[PDB]
Design an enzyme around this catalytic site. Structure first.
Site, short mmCIF file in Angstrom:
data_model
loop_
_atom_site.label_atom_id
_atom_site.label_comp_id
_atom_site.label_asym_id
_atom_site.label_seq_id
_atom_site.Cartn_x
_atom_site.Cartn_y
_atom_site.Cartn_z
N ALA A 1 -2.67 -4.28 9.41
CA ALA A 1 -3.96 -3.59 9.40
C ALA A 1 -4.55 -3.50 10.80
O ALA A 1 -5.01 -2.44 11.23
CB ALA A 1 -4.92 -4.30 8.49
N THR B 1 0.80 -1.22 0.00
CA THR B 1 0.00 0.00 0.00
C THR B 1 0.84 1.29 0.00
O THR B 1 2.05 1.26 0.18
CB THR B 1 -0.97 0.03 1.20
OG1 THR B 1 -0.37 0.73 2.29
CG2 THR B 1 -1.32 -1.38 1.63
C1 LIG Z 1 1.93 -0.79 2.88
O1 LIG Z 1 1.42 -2.04 3.07
C2 LIG Z 1 2.32 -3.04 2.87
C3 LIG Z 1 3.44 -2.98 3.71
C4 LIG Z 1 4.44 -3.94 3.59
C5 LIG Z 1 5.67 -3.84 4.55
C6 LIG Z 1 5.27 -3.07 5.80
C7 LIG Z 1 6.26 -2.01 6.20
C8 LIG Z 1 6.11 -1.30 7.53
C9 LIG Z 1 7.33 -0.67 8.16
N1 LIG Z 1 8.09 -1.43 9.13
C10 LIG Z 1 7.30 -2.48 9.75
C11 LIG Z 1 7.84 -3.84 9.38
C12 LIG Z 1 9.15 -4.22 10.02
N2 LIG Z 1 10.30 -3.36 9.95
C13 LIG Z 1 11.56 -3.72 10.63
C14 LIG Z 1 11.93 -5.16 11.02
C15 LIG Z 1 12.15 -5.57 12.48
C16 LIG Z 1 13.31 -6.47 12.93
C17 LIG Z 1 12.95 -7.26 14.18
C18 LIG Z 1 14.18 -7.62 15.08
C19 LIG Z 1 14.60 -8.95 15.24
C20 LIG Z 1 15.72 -9.28 16.06
O2 LIG Z 1 16.14 -10.59 16.21
C21 LIG Z 1 16.15 -11.20 17.45
C22 LIG Z 1 16.41 -8.23 16.73
O3 LIG Z 1 17.52 -8.53 17.55
C23 LIG Z 1 18.78 -8.81 16.98
C24 LIG Z 1 15.99 -6.88 16.59
O4 LIG Z 1 16.68 -5.86 17.26
C25 LIG Z 1 16.48 -5.62 18.61
C26 LIG Z 1 14.87 -6.59 15.76
C27 LIG Z 1 10.48 -2.08 9.28
C28 LIG Z 1 9.51 -1.07 9.32
C29 LIG Z 1 4.29 -4.96 2.61
C30 LIG Z 1 3.15 -5.05 1.73
O5 LIG Z 1 3.08 -6.08 0.77
C31 LIG Z 1 2.44 -7.30 0.97
C32 LIG Z 1 2.12 -4.05 1.85
O6 LIG Z 1 0.96 -4.04 1.02
C33 LIG Z 1 -0.19 -4.77 1.31
#
Ligand SMILES: COc1cc(/C=C/CCCN2CCCN(CCC/C=C/c3cc(OC)c(OC)c(OC)c3)CC2)cc(OC)c1OC
Lengths: 204, 212, 244, 241, 242, 196, 232, 249
Positions: free
Chosen positions: B49, B1
Site C-alpha cells: 500500500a 485485492t
Molecule cells: C492485491 O493485494 C494483495 C496482493 C498480494 C500479492 C501482491 C502481488 C503483487 C505483484 N508482485 C509483487 C510481489 C512480488 N513478486 C515477485 C517476487 C520477487 C522475487 C525476489 C528475488 C529474490 C532473489 O533472491 C536473492 C533473486 O535472486 C536470485 C531475484 O532475482 C534477481 C529476485 C511478483 C509480482 C496478496 C494479498 O493478500 C494478502 C493482497 O490482498 C490484500
C-alpha cells in the site's frame, strides 16, 4: 553449486626429452547437457602454453587477462615471457583474488628459450604452485588422470613416443568421466617447433 | 485485492476494489487503490500500500518537472519508465508493487503499462492484478470488445471487480471506477459491493446459487 | 595564501590562445626532428636523436620510436619522460580494447583517446601540459595504413606525410615537393632520409644519430610487420642512398 | 583538488575567461548553416594552413550526434570533441530513459548547459568553442537550427555563421535570406550556403565541406565534385556581369 | 591576487558588486503587481534579424502560481530556475500544497553566495556569483499577489513594481510615478508596454518584447504575439491624446 | 521456462523466442518480443529473471548504438558478443548479478557470414550452428543434431525450427504461447509475419 | 596601497586583521537597531530600511526559539546562516536535553562559529552584526555579537548607521530602563525613544518599525505593521 | 594537512624551457663528480666520499647503494633527494616486479621506473623536481650488463661510460679517449680510478673514494647454500683496503 564442476573439462601436461606435451578435452557442458564440442582449453602466449580447466566463464576471462598482461610484458621487456616467469605471473594473479577466486585449475607448459629446459607447472584456484618434472593434471577427471599418468609415464620419452603416452592417458581418463570428452587436442612442443593433433574419440 | 485496467475505442476504463486486510482482519473497506498521479495519469494500488501510494505520488512530482522543462505532456511510456527504473534500482530490497500506469496522449492513444517491484514493465490492452485477479480476468476476457460503448465498458469493469469481490476473501468493500480520456480522466463514483451485488443479481439474473 | 604561487596553467590569453600549449609547442620546436610518410604499401618513421656522444649506446637506446601495438607505432618529439607516461597509457588502452572486443584497436580510436587526455590537461587540474608531439603509424582493416599527428593542445590530424619537432617549415616544404600518392616504401624511406639530411642542425647525418621504423604488409597477406631498425641496418640503408 | 576560480567577474562586470574563449572562436575556421523549407545545410571551411593532409582520416567538421541531428563547431578542436562525446551519450541516455530521440532544442539546451557549467566551476576554463546544432525533431518535418556560445547561451536561427569573418558572412546572409521565402529545395539551400561561404574562403572547392539534413534521419555529406559543380555554377552566374 | 570572496574597505563583496554591473548590462525586465494580478515584461533584444525571436526565453514558469523574469547573463539563470522548479514541486510532494512565493524566493536566494574557494564549513561549490537577477512573480493564499527582486547578493526585496537591467532607474522612476494601489491588471499591462518602449533600444512590437501575467484564476500565462501586438495598438491610441 | 532458440543456416541467422509472460498464476501477455536490435545487422534474444532481462538488453542496445554513432561503424557480431560476454562476467561477481541468458544473431557484413553466439548469465560464451537457453536444448538438440546442415536455406532452417517448436509444444508442461521468428541476413533484420 | 588585506589569514605588521575590520564596516552601513532589557523583559527595536517607496522594508528581527531571537544590522544572508545555526543549537538543546538553551551559551556558539571564518584561508568573515535577546533561567538577557567573534552581555545597546545616538541615550537612562519590570509596553516606548536618537532624518512609520519582545510572561514575539502603530 | 598546492610548480616559460628542471639540472652540475664504466664482463660506478668535517664518519657517508642484488646506483647533486629516491627504487623493484614475476627487474626497467617517479615531480601539483642525477649499473640475464643515466627531467640514456657533477666535462673527455669495447672489468676499474683522480681536489685514498662493481656472482655473499640455481649477488662494494691495494698504479 560446485563451480569447478558445472562445465567439466580436463587438461594434462607431461615432460619428455627436450620436449613437453599438453592436452585437453573439447567439452563444454551445462551440467548434464553437452553444449559445445569445440571448447578448447589450451592457450598460448609466445612459446608459453597455458591450459585452464574449471568454470568456463573464468577460463575465458583468465585467458583474455594473461593475453593482456603478456602483451604488456613484451612491449616493456622487449622479449617473450618464459614459462618459469609466467608461472609466477599466474600464481600472483590468482592470489590477487584470494577471497573471491577464479574457479580454475591452470597448467603451464613450455620450453625455456634460453636454457632449452622443459618446464611444466600446475596451480590450485588461489595460486599455489605445483612444479614437477613428470606430469601435471587438472579437471573433473583429475583422479583418473592421476591413475593413468602414474602408470603410463616414463622419463625422457622422445616427442612422438610422448605423444602416444599423453594421448592414451587423456583419452582413457575422459572415458571414465561423465563431464569430459567430445574431442581432444594434443600439443607436442619443442624449442624448434610445435605440433597440434586433434584426437579421434567416442562422442557420448 | 482486485484492480483492473483495459483500453478500448473510448479510452481506458480503470476499476478497483477497496478492501485492506492484515491477516484475517479486514482493516478497511474504504481504501483508494487508484492513485491520481495527475489529471491525465492514473495508477492502481497492489502489493505494498505504502510503496504504491508513495512512489506513484513521487511519480507525479517527476511528471510535473518534466512538463516544466520540456513544455509538453509526458508520454505514458516515459512516465511508466520513470516508475519502472526507480523500482529496479531497489530490486532485492523488498519493495512490493504491482500496478497499471494508465494515460491517454495524442502521440500514443489509450496506453497501459503494467509495472511491478521485480522491474517488469509491459505494454498491454488488458491487465488485472491482485488476489482477486483471476476472477476479474474471466469476466473481462469473455466480454471485452474493442468497440465497447463507454457506458458498457464502465459496466464490464464494474462487473469484473464484483465477480472477484464475491469469490475472493481479500477483495471487496466497494468499486471505484475511472474513465481515462485524452482530456484527462473522469471519476465515475464509488459503488458499495453490498448494494451492487443485489442489484446486479436481480437485474442481470446471475449469481443464481445465492439466496436473495 | 597559496593562490599567489599559482601559474594558472589552463587560462586563455586575451587573444584566446593557451599560454602553456603555445609555450609547450615552442618547447617541442627544439626537439629532434621526426618524420612520417605513408606509401601505398607502408608507412615510414624516421627521427633524429637530439643528443649523441660517442659513448652513448645505440642499440640499447630509445627516445624517438616506440611500439604501441603489433600494428601501431609512434615517433616522439619532445620530453621523453612525458612521452613514456603517455605511451604506457596508450598501450593499456589498446589492450583494454582487445580484451573487450577481441579485436585490435583501430588506429584512430587509440589516437583520439590519447589526444583527449592531453586535451584534459589544458582544461582542468591546474597542471602543466605534456611537452610532447606524436606522429602515429598504424594499420587497421577499416582504413588500412594511417598516419596521425597529435600535440599538447590535444589536437590530432591525419597525414600522407608530416614532420614534428625542429625545422618543420623546412621539412614540410621539402616533403610537399617530392611526395607522390603512388609512392612505395623504398621511395618513402629515401625521401625521409633525404629530408632529414637537409634539415639537420648538424654536420652530416650518420647512423648513430638516427632512429628508423617501417610498417609493412610483408610476404603473408593479412599480417602487418613492424620493423624497428637496428643500428647496422640504418647504417647499411644510409649507404644505399646517396649518403655515407 | 584544483578548484581555483578561473572564471570570475572584473569591475566592469565582464568575465574575461569567457570572453577570451570567444576570441578562440573567431580564430577557428568559419562555419555556417541555413534552413531550407524542408532541410538544413551545414557549410564549413577547410583549413588551408598546410597540405599533404590525409583527407579520409582527418576528423570532419560536422559530427552526427544522433541519426537525425548534427553538430558543427568553430574554435578549439580538442575542446569540441569533449562536447560532442557528452551530447552523443546524452542522446543515447535520453532514448534509453524516455523511449524517444532527443528534439534538436533539447540537445542544444543540453550542450549549452555543459558550457555554462564550465564558466562557473573551480579549476576549469570555459570552452573555446561555439556550435551549430541542426536536424529535425522525431516525426517532424520542420527544420531546426541553433547556435551555442562559450557562455552557455543558445538560440534559434533562420541562418547563422561563426568563426573567422563570420561577421562578413552574417552580413551577406541577412541581405540574402528572405524569411518569407526560404530556399524551398535542397539545391536552393545548398547553393545559398556555398554563396555565403565562398565569399570568404576563395575559390577552393577543396576548402569547403557540406552536409545536408532532411527529415527522418536523411543525413548526407557531399563529395568535392558535388560542391565543385556548385562553385562553378556561381562563378558563371557572376561572370555574367 | 585576492580572494573571490573578499571584502572591499567599504564592507562590500567585490565579486557580488561586479556582478551587479553585468546585470545593468542586461536586457530590461519590468514587473508590476496589481490586485487583479501581477504582470511581467521583458525586452527580447535580438542580436541579428536572422535570429528567431521566438527562441528568446526571458520569462519562465516556475510553478502554476509562480512566474519568473530575468536580466543579466541569462545562461546563469538556467540552474537557478531548475532549483526553483525542483523546490516548488518538492514542497508540494512533502506537504500537499503550493509553496509560498516568499519561501520559494528565499530558496533561490540561499543558492546565491554559495561561492568561493574552500570556505570552511561544508561546500561553497561555485567559482563566482550569479550574473543575472530575477523578478519572481506569484500568488498564494496568505499574501495574495507578490513581486520579488532576487539579486546575486542572496538578498531579495518585495516591490509593488520594479525594473532591472538597462535603464532600470529610468524605468523605476517612471514606475514610481505611475504606480498606485488601485491599478487594474489591464492598466498594468499598457504601463509595462509604455515603460519598455521608452527604455528599449529598438522600437516596440510583439516581436521584440514579450508580456506575461499570473492570475489566481488561471495561474501563469505568457502572452502570444497577436495578443501582445493588440496591446501595443491599445497604447498607441491611448498615447495620441492630451 | 522461456523459449530461446537460434540456428544459423547458409547465409542467415534465425531466432525463435517464446511469446508468453507469466507472473505467478496468470499469463499476463502472449505477444511478447524477447529481442532487441543492436545494429542493423545484429539481433539479441534474451530470457531469464523478470526485471533483469530487459534492463540488460536495453543497456546493451544503448552501448552498441553509442559506439555506432561515435565511429560511423557497425561493430562486428563477434565484437558485439565479446562486449556482452564481458558485461555478464562483470555482473556475475557484482552485488546483484543480472540473471539473463542471451543468443546473439548477426550477419558479419565484412566477412559475409552469419554468426550465432550463445552466452549465459555467468559469462560463458560459445559460438554455435544452433543453440538454446534453459530447458529448450533438452527437447530440440536431438532434432538439430540430426537434421542440421551447414548449407541449409533459410526455408529449410525455418522448417527445422517448425519441427523443434512442435516437439516443444507436445512434451513441455508449460504453454509458452508460440514463438516470434526473426531473421538476420545481409539485408538486415526481419520478422516472419506468420509462423505456426 | 597596503598589502595585508587580500584575505582573512593575514596579520598586518600592526597586528590587525583588515578583512575582519572591513566586515565590521559592512555593519555600520546597515540600518540601525536597538536592544535593551529590564529584569522581566528584553526588547529589540529595529529600523528596517527600504530601497524604493515601491519596495518593502528588510525584516531585521529573527526568532531563534520560543525564548530567544535576534536583530540584524549588516549583510542579511549572513544573519540567515547565523540565526539558522542558532535555531539548530537551540533545538538540539531541547530535543537532547529537554533544556532551554542559555542565552550566554548561544553567544559562545556564535563566537566560535565566527572565529573559524577568521583563521582559515578561502573563507570570509561574517558581514553582519547581531543583537540577541532572551529570557532563560537567569532572567532577561541582551547580547551584542560582532563578526570578529566578540560577544558581550549588556543592559542595552545599538548597532548600525548612526548607532551612537541611541547608544548614548541608553548610557544615561540605564538607571531608569532596568528598573521598569513588569511593564513591557513602556520598555518598548523606552526602546523606541532610544532609536529616535539615530534618525537623520526620517520619521518612524508603521512600515519601518519592528519591535520584538521576550520575557517572564512572554515568548519571543515579533510586532510589525498595525501592531506597532501604538508606539507612534 | 590542507595541502592546497594542487597546481603545478614546473611550468613552461615563453622560451619553451621548463625552468625548475633547468635549475635542478644546475644543482646537479655543482654536485661532486661521480662516474660509470661498462666493461665486457662487469660495470664500475665511482664517486668521491667528500667528508665535511673529519669528525664525520666515512662509512656513514654512502653514495653507492645496492638497489637489487644485481643493480647499483650512485649520484651527483642533492644527497637527501637521492636517499629518498633509493628507497622508493628498492620498494618499486619488489612491488611492481618481485611480487608479481618472482624475480628482480631487469636493469632498464627499474631505471624507467625511477624515471617515472622523477617525471612526476616535474609535473604533479605542489612539488619541485629532484635535484639529482643517477648513474645506475646492472646485469640481468637477457640484456647482460648495462649502465644508465637518469636526470631530474625523467629522461634516461644508456652509456658505455659517462660522468656527472662538477668535473663531468673533463671526465667525459678523458673517458672518451680511454674507452674501448674490450676492457676487462679490472681495466675499467683502473680507468675509473684514474678519471676520479683529476676531479678529486685533495686526499685520494680508499676512505675518500667509493667504488662498486656489478660483476660476477658472489656465492660467498649469498648467506645460504643448498639451491645451486641461486647464485650470489652480482653487486659488490669494494673495501678501502681493496681500493688502496690497487692504487699502486
Ligand atoms: C492485491 O493485494 C494483495 C496482493 C498480494 C500479492 C501482491 C502481488 C503483487 C505483484 N508482485 C509483487 C510481489 C512480488 N513478486 C515477485 C517476487 C520477487 C522475487 C525476489 C528475488 C529474490 C532473489 O533472491 C536473492 C533473486 O535472486 C536470485 C531475484 O532475482 C534477481 C529476485 C511478483 C509480482 C496478496 C494479498 O493478500 C494478502 C493482497 O490482498 C490484500
Amino acid at each position: 553449486s560446485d563451480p569447478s564442476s558445472i562445465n567439466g573439462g580436463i587438461v594434462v601436461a607431461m615432460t619428455g626429452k627436450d620436449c613437453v606435451a599438453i592436452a585437453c578435452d573439447l567439452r563444454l557442458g551445462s551440467q548434464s547437457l553437452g553444449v559445445s564440442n569445440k571448447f578448447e582449453k589450451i592457450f598460448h602466449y609466445g612459446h608459453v602454453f597455458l591450459g585452464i580447466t574449471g568454470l568456463a566463464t573464468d577460463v575465458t576471462t583468465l585467458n583474455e587477462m594473461f593475453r593482456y598482461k603478456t602483451n604488456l610484458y613484451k612491449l616493456k621487456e622487449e622479449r617473450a615471457i618464459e614459462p618459469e616467469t609466467f608461472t609466477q605471473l599466474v600464481s600472483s594473479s590468482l592470489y590477487e583474488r584470494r577471497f573471491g577466486p577464479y574457479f580454475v585449475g591452470p597448467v603451464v607448459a613450455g620450453i625455456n628459450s634460453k636454457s632449452g629446459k622443459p618446464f611444466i607447472a600446475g596451480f590450485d584456484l588461489i595460486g599455489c604452485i605445483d612444479e614437477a618434472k613428470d606430469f601435471i593434471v587438472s579437471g573433473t577427471a583429475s583422479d583418473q588422470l592421476f591413475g593413468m599418468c602414474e602408470s603410463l609415464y616414463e622419463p625422457n620419452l622422445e616427442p612422438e613416443d610422448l605423444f602416444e603416452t599423453i594421448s592414451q592417458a587423456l583419452l582413457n581418463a575422459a572415458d571414465r568421466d561423465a563431464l569430459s570428452g567430445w574431442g581432444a587436442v594434443v600439443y607436442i612442443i619443442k624449442k624448434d617447433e610445435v605440433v597440434k593433433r586433434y584426437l579421434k574419440m567416442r562422442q557420448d | 485485492t482486485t484492480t483492473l485496467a483495459f483500453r478500448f475505442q473510448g479510452g481506458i476504463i480503470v476499476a478497483v476494489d477497496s478492501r485492506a486486510t492484515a491477516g484475517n482482519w479486514v482493516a478497511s473497506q474504504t481504501v483508494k487503490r487508484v492513485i491520481e498521479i495527475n489529471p491525465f495519469l492514473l495508477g492502481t494500488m497492489a502489493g505494498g500500500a505504502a510503496d504504491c501510494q508513495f512512489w506513484e505520488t513521487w511519480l507525479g512530482s517527476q511528471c510535473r518537472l518534466h512538463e516544466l522543462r520540456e513544455k509538453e505532456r509526458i508520454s505514458v511510456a516515459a512516465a511508466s519508465k520513470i516508475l519502472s527504473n526507480l523500482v529496479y534500482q531497489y530490486k532485492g530490497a523488498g519493495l512490493s508493487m504491482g500496478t497499471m500506469i494508465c494515460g491517454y496522449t495524442r502521440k500514443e492513444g489509450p496506453t497501459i503499462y503494467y509495472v511491478d517491484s521485480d522491474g517488469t514493465r509491459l505494454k498491454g490492452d488488458i491487465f488485472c492484478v491482485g488476489s482477486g485477479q483471476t476472477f476479474a480476468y474471466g469476466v473481462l476476457d469473455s466480454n471485452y470488445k474493442w468497440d465497447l460503448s463507454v457506458e458498457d465498458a464502465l459496466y464490464l469493469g464494474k462487473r469484473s471487480i464484483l465477480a472477484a469481490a464475491h469469490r475472493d476473501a481479500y477483495s471487496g468493500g466497494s468499486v471505484n471506477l475511472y474513465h481515462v480520456t485524452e482530456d484527462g480522466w473522469i471519476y465515475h463514483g464509488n459503488h458499495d459491493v453490498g448494494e451492487l451485488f443485489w442489484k446486479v443479481k436481480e437485474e442481470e439474473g446471475s449469481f443464481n446459487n445465492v439466496i436473495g | 595564501g597559496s593562490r599567489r604561487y599559482d601559474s594558472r596553467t589552463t587560462i586563455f590569453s586575451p587573444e584566446g590562445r593557451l599560454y602553456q600549449v603555445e609555450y609547450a609547442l615552442e618547447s617541442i620546436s627544439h626537439a629532434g626532428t621526426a618524420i612520417g610518410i605513408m606509401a601505398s604499401d607502408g608507412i615510414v618513421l624516421a627521427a633524429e636523436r637530439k643528443v649523441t656522444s660517442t659513448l652513448l649506446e645505440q642499440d640499447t637506446s630509445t627516445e624517438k620510436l616506440y611500439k604501441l601495438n603489433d600494428k601501431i607505432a609512434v615517433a616522439v618529439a619532445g620530453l621523453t619522460a612525458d612521452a613514456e607516461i603517455l605511451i604506457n597509457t596508450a598501450r593499456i588502452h589498446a589492450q583494454n580494447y582487445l580484451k573487450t572486443y577481441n579485436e585490435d584497436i583501430p588506429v584512430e580510436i587509440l589516437v583520439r583517446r590519447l589526444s583527449d587526455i592531453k586535451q584534459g590537461y589544458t582544461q582542468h587540474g591546474g597542471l602543466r601540459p605534456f611537452g610532447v608531439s606524436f606522429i602515429y603509424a598504424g594499420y587497421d582493416d577499416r582504413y588500412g595504413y594511417q598516419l596521425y599527428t597529435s600535440n599538447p593542445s590535444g589536437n590530432y590530424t591525419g597525414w600522407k606525410a608530416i614532420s614534428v619537432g625542429a625545422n618543420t617549415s623546412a621539412a614540410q616544404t621539402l616533403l610537399q615537393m617530392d611526395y607522390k600518392d603512388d609512392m612505395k616504401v623504398d621511395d618513402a624511406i629515401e625521401l625521409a632520409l633525404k629530408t632529414l639530411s637537409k634539415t639537420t642542425d648538424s654536420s652530416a647525418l650518420t647512423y648513430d644519430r638516427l632512429e628508423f621504423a617501417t610498417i609493412r604488409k610483408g610476404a603473408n597477406d593479412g599480417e602487418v610487420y613492424q620493423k624497428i631498425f637496428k643500428p647496422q641496418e640504418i647504417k647499411d640503408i644510409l649507404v644505399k642512398t646517396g649518403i655515407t | 583538488g584544483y578548484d581555483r576560480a578561473l572564471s570570475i567577474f572584473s569591475p566592469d562586470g565582464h568575465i574575461f575567461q569567457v570572453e577570451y574563449a570567444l576570441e578562440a572562436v573567431k580564430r577557428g575556421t568559419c562555419a555556417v548553416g541555413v534552413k531550407g523549407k524542408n532541410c538544413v545545410v551545414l557549410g564549413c571551411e577547410r583549413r588551408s594552413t598546410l597540405k599533404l593532409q590525409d583527407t579520409r582520416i582527418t576528423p570532419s567538421k560536422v559530427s552526427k550526434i544522433d541519426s537525425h541531428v548534427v553538430l558543427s563547431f568553430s574554435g578549439l578542436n580538442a575542446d569540441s570533441r569533449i562536447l560532442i562525446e557528452k551530447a552523443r551519450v546524452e542522446a543515447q541516455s535520453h532514448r534509453l530513459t524516455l523511449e524517444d530521440p532527443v528534439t534538436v532544442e533539447y540537445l542544444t539546451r543540453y550542450v549549452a548547459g555543459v558550457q555554462q557549467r564550465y564558466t562557473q566551476s573551480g579549476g576549469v576554463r570555459p570552452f573555446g568553442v561555439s556550435t551549430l546544432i541542426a536536424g529535425f525533431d522525431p516525426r517532424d518535418d520542420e527544420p531546426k537550427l541553433y547556435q551555442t556560445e562559450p557562455s552557455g547561451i543558445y538560440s534559434s536561427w533562420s541562418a547563422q555563421t561563426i568563426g573567422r569573418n563570420s561577421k562578413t558572412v552574417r552580413e551577406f546572409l541577412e541581405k540574402n535570406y528572405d524569411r518569407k521565402e526560404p530556399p524551398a529545395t535542397v539545391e536552393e539551400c545548398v547553393k545559398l550556403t556555398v554563396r555565403s561561404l565562398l565569399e570568404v574562403v576563395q575559390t577552393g572547392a577543396k576548402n569547403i565541406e557540406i552536409t545536408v539534413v532532411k527529415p527522418d534521419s536523411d543525413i548526407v555529406a557531399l563529395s568535392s565534385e558535388e560542391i565543385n559543380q556548385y562553385v562553378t555554377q556561381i562563378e558563371q552566374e557572376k561572370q555574367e556581369q | 591576487d585576492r580572494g573571490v570572496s573578499t571584502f572591499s574597505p567599504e564592507g562590500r563583496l567585490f565579486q557580488v558588486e561586479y556582478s551587479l554591473e553585468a546585470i545593468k548590462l542586461g536586457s530590461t525586465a519590468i514587473g508590476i503587481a496589481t490586485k487583479e494580478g501581477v504582470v511581467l515584461g521583458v525586452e527580447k533584444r535580438a542580436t541579428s534579424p536572422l535570429l528567431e525571436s521566438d527562441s528568446i526565453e526571458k520569462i519562465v514558469e516556475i510553478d502554476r502560481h509562480i512566474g519568473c523574469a530575468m536580466s543579466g547573463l541569462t545562461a546563469d539563470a538556467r540552474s537557478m530556475i531548475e532549483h526553483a522548479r525542483t523546490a516548488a514541486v518538492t514542497h508540494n510532494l512533502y506537504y500537499d500544497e503550493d509553496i509560498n512565493v516568499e519561501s520559494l524566493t528565499q530558496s533561490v536566494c540561499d543558492l546565491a553566495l554559495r561561492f568561493g574557494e574552500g570556505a570552511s564549513g561544508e561546500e561553497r561549490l561555485m567559482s563566482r556569483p550569479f550574473g543575472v537577477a530575477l523578478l519572481i512573480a506569484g500568488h498564494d493564499a496568505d499574501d495574495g499577489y507578490q513581486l520579488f527582486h532576487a539579486e546575486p547578493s542572496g538578498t531579495f526585496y518585495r516591490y509593488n513594481a520594479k525594473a532591472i537591467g538597462s535603464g532600470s532607474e529610468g524605468a523605476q522612476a517612471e514606475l514610481l510615478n505611475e504606480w498606485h494601489s488601485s491599478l487594474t491588471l489591464k492598466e498594468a499591462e499598457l504601463l509595462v508596454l509604455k515603460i519598455l518602449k521608452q527604455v528599449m533600444e529598438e522600437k516596440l512590437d510583439e516581436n521584440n518584447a514579450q508580456l506575461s501575467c499570473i492570475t489566481k484564476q488561471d495561474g501563469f500565462k505568457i502572452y502570444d504575439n497577436e495578443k501582445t501586438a493588440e496591446l501595443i495598438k491599445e497604447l498607441k491610441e491611448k498615447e495620441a491624446a492630451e | 521456462m522461456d523459449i530461446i532458440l537460434g540456428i544459423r543456416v547458409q547465409d542467415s541467422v534465425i531466432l525463435a523466442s517464446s511469446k508468453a509472460v507469466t507472473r505467478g498464476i496468470s499469463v499476463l501477455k502472449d505477444s511478447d518480443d524477447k529481442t532487441r536490435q543492436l545494429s542493423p545487422h545484429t539481433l539479441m534474444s534474451f530470457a531469464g529473471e523478470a526485471g533483469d532481462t530487459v534492463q540488460f538488453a536495453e543497456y546493451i542496445q544503448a552501448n552498441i548504438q553509442l559506439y555506432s554513432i561515435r565511429e560511423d561503424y557497425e561493430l562486428s557480431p563477434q565484437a558485439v558478443s565479446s562486449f556482452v560476454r564481458q558485461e555478464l562476467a562483470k555482473s556475475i561477481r557484482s552485488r546483484r548479478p543480472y540473471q539473463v541468458n542471451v543468443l546473439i544473431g548477426g550477419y558479419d557484413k565484412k566477412k559475409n557470414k552469419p554468426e550465432l553466439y550463445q552466452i549465459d548469465y555467468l559469462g560463458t560464451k560459445v559460438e554455435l550452428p544452433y543453440g538454446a537457453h534453459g530447458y529448450s536444448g533438452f527437447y530440440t538438440f536431438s532434432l538439430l543434431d540430426h537434421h542440421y546442415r551447414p548449407d541449409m536455406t533459410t526455408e529449410e532452417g525455418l522448417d527445422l525450427l517448425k519441427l523443434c517448436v512442435q516437439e516443444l509444444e507436445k512434451r513441455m508442461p508449460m504453454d509458452f504461447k508460440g514463438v516470434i521468428v526473426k531473421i538476420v541476413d545481409k539485408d538486415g533484420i526481419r520478422q516472419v509475419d506468420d509462423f505456426q | 596601497r597596503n598589502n595585508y588585506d587580500g584575505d582573512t589569514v593575514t596579520f598586518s605588521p600592526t597586528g590587525r586583521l583588515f578583512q575582519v575590520e572591513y566586515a565590521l564596516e559592512a555593519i555600520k552601513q546597515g540600518s540601525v537597531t536597538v536592544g535593551l532589557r529590564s529584569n522581566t523583559h528584553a526588547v529589540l527595536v529595529a529600523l528596517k530600511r527600504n530601497a524604493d517607496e515601491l519596495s518593502s522594508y528588510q525584516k531585521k528581527i529573527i526568532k531563534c526559539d520560543e525564548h530567544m531571537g535576534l536583530s540584524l544590522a549588516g549583510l542579511a544572508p549572513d544573519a540567515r546562516v547565523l540565526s539558522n545555526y542558532l535555531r539548530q543549537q537551540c533545538n538540539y538543546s531541547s530535543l537532547v536535553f529537554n533544556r532551554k538553551l542559555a542565552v550566554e551559551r548561544a553567544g559562545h556558539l556564535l563566537c566560535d562559529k565566527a572565529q573559524k571564518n577568521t583563521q582559515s584561508y578561502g573563507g570570509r568573515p561574517y558581514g553582519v552584526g547581531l543583537l540577541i535577546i532572551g529570557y532563560d533561567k537567569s532572567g532577561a538577557h541582551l547580547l551584542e555579537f560582532q563578526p570578529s567573534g566578540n560577544v558581550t552581555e549588556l543592559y542595552g545597546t545599538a548597532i548600525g548607521a548612526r548607532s551612537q545616538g541611541a547608544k548614548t541615550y541608553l548610557e544615561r537612562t540605564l538607571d531608569t530602563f532596568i528598573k521598569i519590570d513588569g511593564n513591557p509596553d513602556e520598555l518598548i516606548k523606552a526602546g523606541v525613544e532610544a532609536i529616535s536618537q539615530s534618525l537623520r532624518d526620517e520619521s518612524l512609520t508603521v512600515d519601518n518599525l519592528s519591535i520584538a519582545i521576550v520575557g517572564k510572561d512572554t515568548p519571543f514575539t515579533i510586532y510589525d505593521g498595525e501592531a506597532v502603530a501604538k508606539y507612534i | 594537512m590542507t595541502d592546497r598546492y594542487s597546481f603545478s610548480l614546473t611550468t613552461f616559460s615563453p622560451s619553451g624551457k621548463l625552468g625548475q628542471i633547468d635549475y635542478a639540472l644546475t644543482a646537479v652540475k655543482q654536485g661532486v663528480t661521480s662516474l660509470g664504466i661498462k666493461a665486457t664482463n662487469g660495470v664500475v660506478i665511482a664517486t668521491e666520499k667528500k667528508s665535511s668535517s673529519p669528525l664525520a664518519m666515512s662509512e656513514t657517508l654512502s653514495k653507492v647503494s645496492l638497489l637489487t642484488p644485481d643493480i647499483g646506483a650512485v649520484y651527483s647533486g642533492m644527497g637527501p633527494d637521492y636517499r629518498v629516491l633509493v628507497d622508493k627504487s628498492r620498494k618499486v623493484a619488489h612491488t611492481s616486479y618481485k611480487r608479481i614475476y618472482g624475480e628482480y627487474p631487469p636493469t632498464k626497467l627499474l631505471v624507467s621506473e625511477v624515471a617515472k617517479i622523477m617525471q612526476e615531480a616535474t609535473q604533479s601539483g605542489g612539488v619541485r623536481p629532484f635535484g639529482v642525477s643517477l648513474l645506475i649499473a646492472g646485469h640481468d640475464e637477457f640484456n647482460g650488463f648495462s649502465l644508465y643515466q637518469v636526470d631530474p627531467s625523467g629522461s634516461y640514456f644508456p652509456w658505455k661510460a659517462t660522468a656527472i657533477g662538477k668535473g663531468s666535462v673533463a671526465a667525459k673527455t678523458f673517458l672518451e679517449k680511454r674507452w674501448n669495447d674490450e676492457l676487462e672489468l679490472e681495466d675499467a676499474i683502473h680507468i675509473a680510478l684514474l678519471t676520479l683522480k683529476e676531479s678529486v681536489e685533495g686526499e685520494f685514498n680508499g676512505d675518500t673514494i667509493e667504488l662498486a662493481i656489478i660483476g660476477d656472482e658472489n656465492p660467498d655473499l649469498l648467506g645460504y647454500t643448498g639451491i645451486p640455481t641461486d647464485k650470489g649477488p652480482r653487486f659488490r662494494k669494494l673495501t678501502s683496503q681493496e681500493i688502496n691495494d690497487r692504487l699502486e698504479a
